[PDB]
Structure 1
Amino acid sequence: TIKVFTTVDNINLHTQVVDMSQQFGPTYLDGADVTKIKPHNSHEGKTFYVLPNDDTLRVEAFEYYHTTDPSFLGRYMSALNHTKKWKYPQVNGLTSIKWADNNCYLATALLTLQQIELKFNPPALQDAYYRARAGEAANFCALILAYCNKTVGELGDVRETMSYLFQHANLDSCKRVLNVVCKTCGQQQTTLKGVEAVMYMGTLSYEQFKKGVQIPCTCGKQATKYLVQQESPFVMMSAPPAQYELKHGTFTCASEYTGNYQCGHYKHITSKETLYCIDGALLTKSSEYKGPITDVFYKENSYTTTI
């Protein structure tokens, strides 16, 4: 006989004596598949992830991961088997990722996540972000890939990754109020709540968003849309990549993207004592920056416009 632990969370462990001769469901050990394995007595006392196969386990996995998808732990453990072999360099006080399996977009998001103020809802994300800040970001990246339905090696979007993670963050109290003025359609005001309130695609400049941007109305003409009010701990401004000048102290972080929609390399720029650009494990300093930026992140508390 062998006495081992089964879990879905790795926080609530079920004592479950296993016989020497699967027999508990598809199971894993430290990220590795143990479906084929008969218990070695090297496993006495070890904990094994078991894909939920009961009501008690299934409600445990939901209170931790906030999802009922049975495929979640399978894609998580499969990503975790790769992410736990990644290197997480300490760059400029932040936890990064050394390049591997086209993880450039995942590293840029991870550096951004450590610089804006988010409160995650699922315990799995709360636990792993603090593990990531402690220097071991393997659980966090594996969960991010699982939540965005992506596999290791696959290419992704920084903006689209943040969008997925914002769905699992308590941004319910964040509010945005917009006014669009078309000259032949009038003046109309819109209120956005939740994730839609902190995300915009169309311009990188938070100042021009405040002063009003030109957008197509349904009349076909150019209409002016401007920010009336913003209640948020941050705002993410995005636009298709194009040359852009980042000025020190006027933003939090930024995503630089060289390439096109089919293939490109992400980089991360952050504003500290000067401009730091973090590639993977590489760091370059600069007082001025100008390059192809596609995301800029700003700090915010509460804003009301003058127009």
Structure 2
Amino acid sequence: KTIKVFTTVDNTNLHTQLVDMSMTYGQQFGPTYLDGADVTKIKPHVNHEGKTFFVLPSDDTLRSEAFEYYHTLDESFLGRYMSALNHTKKWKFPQVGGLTSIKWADNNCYLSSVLLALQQLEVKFNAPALQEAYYRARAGDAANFCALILAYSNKTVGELGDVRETMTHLLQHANLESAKRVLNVVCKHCGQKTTTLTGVEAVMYMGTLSYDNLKTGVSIPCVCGRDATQYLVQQESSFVMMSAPPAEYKLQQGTFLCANEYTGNYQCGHYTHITAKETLYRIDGAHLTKMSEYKGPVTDVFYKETSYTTTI
């Protein structure tokens, strides 16, 4: 018997295929799904006629389309994306404080913090799978975006994860092509030195939560002797992300865009997100509390930027 169905790896280009009556889908299409339903080992029915199956890039056309959509060559990627989607599609995405958040499940609080921060930054993704899923996320349909974050970060539903590390992976697919950071390492003796950073390191800094501190000078146990200071001479980007091991830190209105706090120890703990609106909002998955000032164990802080150049 002859039956007509569609395959795809990007949900955008569908390919008409003629499936054989007898055999299942795995020895015909390889690994195959149908609405997150691993029917690789399931025989073809007849209500199938006309419907669309996901598959793995078996041939040059599918591999090229997968690459164009996802911007990865990783052969495990699509399977990993699928098994995450099975779960994330069961998560809830309420609107909290004007933003799409995520109701706690499967230690997804780090993901909620990543999702909340991104919505407040002037940032776009170059990979079409990310830009499309993100558009939908901002509108409350975030299951796909979350599964994609997991897949790009090499993380699995149910693991706790680190927000900074996650952003490190995601921002490699962000519109950073024009971002630029110039730092100066100065010394009492040693000498004078300038460093230019681009891509991810133009916007991500690890070692202080304070953007002011990076502007006035941050100190470090030097390589030739005593006390090197690092100071920002120039910044070109729409935001910066300052991270540090969690530490007691006061967040005041009008001084930052948003932040993550982390309570617990390295192995096990809990993130919440703080954003500065008419007052401070602390968004803890589905829950909201409000406060005029916060002091607690902050670990990332986001600040708005356009262009900065130094006075030193």
TM-score, normalising length: structure 2: 0.96
Q: 1:268 pairs with 245, 268, 273, which one?
A: 273
Asked if the contact 2:190/2:225 (under 8 Å) is kept, the reply is no
Q: Closer, same or farther in 2 for the Cα pair 1:249/1:42, shift >3 Å? A: farther
Q: 1:131 pairs with 121, 129, 136, which one?
A: 136
Task: Output aligned runs, 1:135-146, within 5 Å.
Answer: 135-146=140-151
Q: Distance in 1 between matches of 2:157 and 2:252?
A: 34
2:47 aligns to what SS in structure 1? helix
Q: Distance in 2 between matches of 1:126 and 1:64?
A: 10
How much does 1:184 deviate?
2.3
How much does 1:20 deviate?
3.0
Which residue of 2 is the match for residue 221 of structure 1? Answer: 226
Q: 2:87 pairs with 82, 89, 93, which one?
A: 82
Tell me which stretches of 4 or more aligned residues in structure 1 moved more than 3 Å.
none
Which residue of 2 is the match for residue 47 of structure 1? Answer: 52
Amino acid across the alignment from 1:8: V
Q: Distance in 2 between matches of 1:190 and 1:27?
A: 49
Which residue of 1 is the match for residue 12 of structure 2? Answer: 11
How much does 1:219 deviate?
2.5
Which residue of 2 is the match for residue 195 of structure 1? Answer: 200
Structure 2 unaligned segments of length 5 or more: list them: none
Amino acid across the alignment from 1:123: P
2:286 aligns to what SS in structure 1? coil
CA shift digits 1:68-116 (9 cap, x unpaired)? 1111100000111111111111111211111111111011001111111
Which residue of 1 is the match for residue 41 of structure 2? Answer: 36
Amino acid across the alignment from 1:20: M
Q: Distance in 2 between matches of 1:115 and 1:9?
A: 27
Moved more, 35-44 or 114-123: 35-44
CA shift digits 1:164-216 (9 cap, x unpaired)? 11101120210011111121211111111111110111111111111111112
Task: Output aligned runs, 1:171-186, within 5 Å.
Answer: 171-186=176-191
**Pairwise CA RMSD of aligned residues?**
1.1
CA shift digits 1:248-298 (9 cap, x unpaired)? 121111010001111111110001111001111001011111111000000
Moved more, 12-21 or 221-230: 12-21
Structure 1 unaligned segments of length 5 or more: list them: none
Q: Distance in 1 between matches of 2:232 and 2:110?
A: 29
Task: Output aligned runs, 1:228-307, within 5 Å.
Answer: 228-307=233-312
Q: Distance in 1 between matches of 2:171 and 2:159?
A: 21
Amino acid across the alignment from 2:271: Y
The alignment of Structure 1 onto Structure 2 pairs a total of residues equal to: 307
Whether 1:98 aligns to 2:103 is yes
Q: 1:167 pairs with 172, 176, 185, which one?
A: 172
Which residue of 2 is the match for residue 20 of structure 1? Answer: 21
Asked if the contact 2:246/2:297 (under 8 Å) is kept, the reply is yes
Q: Distance in 2 between matches of 1:29 and 1:256?
A: 39
Q: Distance in 1 between matches of 2:49 and 2:119?
A: 37
1:135 aligns to what SS in structure 2? coil
2:213 aligns to what SS in structure 1? helix
Q: Distance in 1 between matches of 2:36 and 2:226?
A: 55
Amino acid across the alignment from 2:173: H
Q: Distance in 2 between matches of 1:289 and 1:14?
A: 54
Q: Distance in 2 between matches of 1:37 and 1:293?
A: 50
Q: 1:156 pairs with 148, 157, 161, which one?
A: 161
How much does 1:47 deviate?
1.1
Q: Distance in 1 between matches of 2:207 and 2:304?
A: 19
1:74 aligns to what SS in structure 2? helix
How much does 1:160 deviate?
0.7
Q: Distance in 2 between matches of 1:281 and 1:64?
A: 31
Q: Distance in 2 between matches of 1:193 and 1:68?
A: 23
Q: Distance in 1 between matches of 2:253 and 2:196?
A: 32
TM-score, normalising length: structure 1: 0.97
